[PDB]
Design a protein around this ligand. Structure first.
Ligand SMILES: Nc1ncnc2c1ncn2[C@@H]1O[C@H](COP(=O)(O)OP(=O)(O)OP(=O)(O)O)[C@@H](O)[C@H]1O
Ligand SMILES: Nc1ncnc2c1ncn2[C@@H]1O[C@H](COP(=O)(O)OP(=O)(O)OP(=O)(O)O)[C@@H](O)[C@H]1O
Ligand SMILES: Cc1c(Br)cnc2c1ncn2CC(=O)C[C@H]1NCCC[C@@H]1O
Ligand SMILES: Cc1c(Br)cnc2c1ncn2CC(=O)C[C@H]1NCCC[C@@H]1O
Ligand SMILES: [Mg+2]
Ligand SMILES: [Mg+2]
Ligand SMILES: [Mg+2]
Ligand SMILES: [Mg+2]
Ligand SMILES: [Zn+2]
Lengths: 482, 483
């Protein structure tokens, strides 16, 4: 690592994702290779979330990636301002297709016809389907590894209910899981909220969301989305059942949708990354402890030193710690120290010849850099403890960081001043789409958009407070954003 | 329930089975099919087993782009263009034509190997063992069929690069053996391992291994999985080179394999084990192995009946049998019988008032239809003993079905005779591409070569000639009509 995250952020991010062997660049703009080090993180997220949504009775499936032209255009499913982001297959070989086919940017236009056919009575609900898949969006904003990629991996759930009550409970549940992904797995604090009228999904009833902060940018980022669609989509797609006991009334399903993507890993990179490279939260690190042999001596002695490392590897596996023994002959220990530091492994387990005679080892934590001499017998207890402290340390630093950088303002005067200090701001807001668009352009004279209306703002709106606009309806979190 | 019959309809029987089982929903784009939870859960199981195994072998999972640049794809003939008509091209986002069209991966060699070349600059950097689970698109000319031949499908592709051929060649047979395990131990489908002849082998490789399975009801064979040794055909094309360890200034090319397996597995499972009552699931991959259905309908009475069903339910989870109690009130047991039968749940656990007071139940195995009266105390033991018998019973019958339909012929006269009986046949083959063409057209509904069996039925008697007549036989070759 040569750039420094506080001075050039773009270079520092580029250098940490590549030198950590997370990302390889591709020759299609906005597309990046996910090497095993980064993909393992995604798998951890995947393993957690998936387990959690199965408890809620969701089931995993897979729907076509191809969207016919008439299907995607059939309903008012998305505003006509998304259409330029849609990538069209137009020929196979050099043989032009009779009609062009779209690559899935989201799956409503492909599963909601299937839901319509599956729902023929109250018995057919609820429908709870989820797919892990790739998604393409020909983004016009600046593409960045894992923040905004023209192809990305994600999970979308689409659900269909007989009553609004059940729909509403799942929206908040799913949002809580996303918040758990970010806070307990990646050690990133987030702010739950509801999107404004401007920033909501146009075709739903209301959009909930988690927002994350990246101090080094001063910018927020949407970490996940959970819509309640009401019946706006069931009416479009005719997802209807007819209650026998309520003759003469159609029952349109109440629907939700929700998504989360590999953008998570980018956030983790920019929140916990330091000027020595990646910093993995133990919760998601595929290697929690790397064992490195030091001090190279007889051949039998050398084999004995390797034996001790692999003994440590076996003890640690037995207590469900993910451990790698870097026993490679071809690199020096110093080289391995730097290598696994760039990769961001939580703990390096250092063991030399005079330590195995001494019945001790060295632990170095990636976050603090503090060295520790630990008795050999107390390895499981001490290394488990240290992993739990790194996670709580990483979440604490970022929590204390988010507290610091998110403050309340009631004047656009202060709001403009605080915003330019690289902070995000909860202001009294009139909700109007115009007032939001005035704030956005005035904050450039890099404008400020709305992030979320917090479910639990910092400060309660004093009755009859006016918007910074119209009276204020709710405190709204505003800021510059990714 | 199931209206078509596998022995006469077949085509419609297959449509009726995959849909009424809730595996497949049809899509409006030709050769594209929705995987519903029931189908997907099978593929889930295969992923779980195979992913565990390749990890034991030191392979790592990753995810490479779906888009392939035109230069990277046409860079080097990593296929003959010949495969060209199968490639779907994106030419525009929204209304706006891209400067250069980009392809949707039909395989990932041209996307991954430029990365390998940059990652290899020394002896140390090998081996590379990467694998991705992903979707792939091929505009198939043949008639599309659910999971057999789809325009889009799901697979894993394992690409690996080695310093030496000894390591590479060892892996190819390991992966192939794994692939055979997916088919024979998970899906109870017997396969024959073998290598492809010159004609049917992958042009981009040195040799191709494969497992072939037989679908009797069809009279055709199907290829279940592919493991190539790429030799050094790709490393030369993408300049994946490492410095010779002994000799200054000299580089060596890497030895590569690639290998893949798709959702087609699920279709073959359906064609082999499916019957005229619908799907039949091997317990190994059956997400619901036993369904508990209550029979015989005061409210005091159902009070106790359900209680004993959920009782049966906790006991079976306690031995990690995957069990589902269908206690739904809105459905008659008869509907539920037919419902889980069509899905092919290995065992039906029936509980009525008659036998709850009897302290016993009935188990109905989906394979044989065999109903067994079971004492309640022996529920953990007996139902797992049944589960395992079901699995080996499915494989025994599918094995002996394959026994019946794969036979030896030494004359093109007999070869044509047995092939038109709806069978596949190992014949002495000279291996030349021209002979393979003539074998195809003379049987023409032509017969293609399937593999050269690693362990053929009979040893070539010394000096035996091919079935053509001009050239001597080099190897027995499994021939047949194929998908
Ligand atoms: N191009 C992208 N690359 C990676 N992740 C993305 C991308 N677009 C969206 N996401 C993530 O996917 C989740 C679901 O996306 P959704 O479509 O609901 O929002 P959106 O249109 O992406 O929003 P925005 O562009 O304001 O980020 C978002 O919460 C976001 O974290
Ligand atoms: N259209 C398809 N749908 C589903 N599975 C397929 C399809 N084409 C190939 N497969 C399977 O995917 C694997 C990938 O190997 P490969 O691409 O070399 O197949 P192939 O030689 O094109 O197959 P085939 O001649 O049977 O179509 C094969 O083992 C095959 O069983
Ligand atoms: C380019 C584009 C199109 Br075309 C259509 N709709 C789009 C879109 N970009 C964002 N959306 C909204 C969207 O995807 C809604 C939810 N889908 C289910 C998972 C969670 C998502 O939040
Ligand atoms: C349309 C097409 C092109 Br363009 C290029 N190559 C093709 C192809 N159809 C089949 N192949 C061969 C292939 O996929 C090789 C291996 N890939 C890795 C997994 C195992 C596979 O067998
Ligand atoms: Mg967007
Ligand atoms: Mg948004
Ligand atoms: Mg093919
Ligand atoms: Mg082939
Ligand atoms: Zn011949």
């Amino acid at each position: 690592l040569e750039a420094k995250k506080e001075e050039n952020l773009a270079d520092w991010y580029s250098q940490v994702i590549t030198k950590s062997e997370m990302i390889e660049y591709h020759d299609i703009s906005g597309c990046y290779i996910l090497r095993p080090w980064a993909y393992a993180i995604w798998e951890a997220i995947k393993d957690f979330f998936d387990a959690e949504i199965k408890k809620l009775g969701v089931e995993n499936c897979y729907f076509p990636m191809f969207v016919s032209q008439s299907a995607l255009e059939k309903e008012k499913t998305h505003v006509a301002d998304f259409a330029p982001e849609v990538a069209w297959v137009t020929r196979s070989g050099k043989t032009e297709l009779a009609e062009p086919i779209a690559i899935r940017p989201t799956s409503e236009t492909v599963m909601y016809p299937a839901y319509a056919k599956w729902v023929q009575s109250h018995r057919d609900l609820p429908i709870k389907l989820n797919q892990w898949c790739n998604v393409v969006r020909w983004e016009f904003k600046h593409p960045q590894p894992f923040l905004r990629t023209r192809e990305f991996l994600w999970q979308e759930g689409h659900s269909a209910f007989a009553t609004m009550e059940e729909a509403a409970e799942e929206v908040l549940q799913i949002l809580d899981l996303y918040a758990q992904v970010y806070e307990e797995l990646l050690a990133i604090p987030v702010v739950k909220g509801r999107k404004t009228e401007k920033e909501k999904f146009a075709g739903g009833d209301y959009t909930t969301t988690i927002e994350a902060f990246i101090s080094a940018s001063g910018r927020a980022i949407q970490g996940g989305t959970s819509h309640h669609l009401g019946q706006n989509f069931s009416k479009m797609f005719e997802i209807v059942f007819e209650d026998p006991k309520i003759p003469g009334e159609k029952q349109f399903a109440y629907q939700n949708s929700w998504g989360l993507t590999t953008r998570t890993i980018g956030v983790m990179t920019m929140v916990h990354g330091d000027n020595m490279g990646l910093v993995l939260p133990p919760r998601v690190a595929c290697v929690q402890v790397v064992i490195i042999p030091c001090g190279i001596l007889s051949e039998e002695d050398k084999e004995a030193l390797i034996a001790k490392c692999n003994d440590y590897r076996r003890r640690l596996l037995s207590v469900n710690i993910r451990v790698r023994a870097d026993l490679r002959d071809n690199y020096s220990p110093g080289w391995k120290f730097n290598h696994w530091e760039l990769k961001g492994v939580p703990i390096r387990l250092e063991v030399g010849p005079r330590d195995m005679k001494s019945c001790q080892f060295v632990a170095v934590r990636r976050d603090t850099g503090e060295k520790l001499t630990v008795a050999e017998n107390e390895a499981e207890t001490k290394l488990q403890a240290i992993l739990e402290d790194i996670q709580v340390t990483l979440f604490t630093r970022a929590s204390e960081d988010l507290k610091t950088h998110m403050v309340v303002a009631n004047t656009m005067e202060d709001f403009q001043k605080i915003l330019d200090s690289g902070k995000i701001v909860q202001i009294p807001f009139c909700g109007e789409i115009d007032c939001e668009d005035w704030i956005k352009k005035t904050t450039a004279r890099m404008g400020a958009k709305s992030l979320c209306i917090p479910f639990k703002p910092l400060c309660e709106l004093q009755p009859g407070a006016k918007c910074v606009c119209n009276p204020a309806k709710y405190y709204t979190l505003f800021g510059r954003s990714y």
